[PDB]
């Protein structure tokens, strides 16, 4: 009992900057700082933007603010707290069945708005800051116009699928792969987030 350890907090380590004409990844914290911040849960950095890059001790992935909640995947974050200026913040939503977790959006973040367009031409924002067209194929599936190796999509779970008007259509969670080639993606539709919130 005396030597039992605790899991650290999820730590924001950067963002996918979508503020201008060019999408690009920015790092805001390096490895040592990330490790320290994960243990204290105290992160005094100013947060900006809609899509954060987040890390645990073992994975780096994405998290997206939609309607004042910072959302990511359960398979990345588990039940972990997130580091914040006031210390660790407990999850507000946890749903292993949807592969979905959420925390109150950090002050300074900007939130996307859920899509009401009912459109099927979508765009996936990756951890490498590419914006890839995705044709919607079902409630939770879309096809990549150009296939990619799965290596390329690893670390992008928690990132958004957007409509042409820039609304949030879903949260990316898993590649649909054959022999290492992703031709499609599985995502959590924004309507499922909306149900969770209401």
């Amino acid at each position: 009992m005396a030597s039992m350890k605790k899991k650290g907090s999820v730590v924001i380590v950067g963002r996918i900057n979508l503020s201008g004409d060019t999408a690009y990844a920015q790092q805001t914290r390096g490895e040592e700082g990330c490790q320290e911040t994960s243990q204290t849960g105290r992160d005094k950095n100013q947060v900006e933007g809609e899509v954060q890059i987040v890390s645990t001790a073992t994975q780096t992935f994405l998290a997206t603010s939609i309607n004042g909640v910072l959302w990511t995947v359960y398979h990345g974050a588990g039940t972990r707290t997130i580091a914040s200026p006031k210390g660790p913040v407990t999850q507000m939503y946890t749903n292993v069945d949807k592969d979905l977790v959420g925390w109150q959006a950090p002050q300074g973040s900007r939130s996307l708005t859920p899509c009401t367009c009912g459109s099927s031409d979508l765009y996936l924002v990756t951890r490498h800051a590419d914006v890839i067209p995705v044709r919607r194929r079902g409630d939770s599936r879309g096809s990549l116009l150009s296939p990619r190796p799965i290596s390329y999509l690893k670390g992008s779970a928690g990132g958004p699928l957007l409509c042409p008007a820039g609304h949030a259509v879903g949260i990316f969670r898993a590649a649909v792969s054959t022999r290492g080639v992703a031709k499609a993606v599985d995502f959590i539709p924004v309507e499922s987030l909306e149900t969770t919130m209401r």
Partner: peptide, 7 residues
């Protein structure tokens, strides 16, 4: 066969 790979 296609499989889901969590990312």
């Amino acid at each position: 066969q296609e499989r889901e790979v969590p990312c």
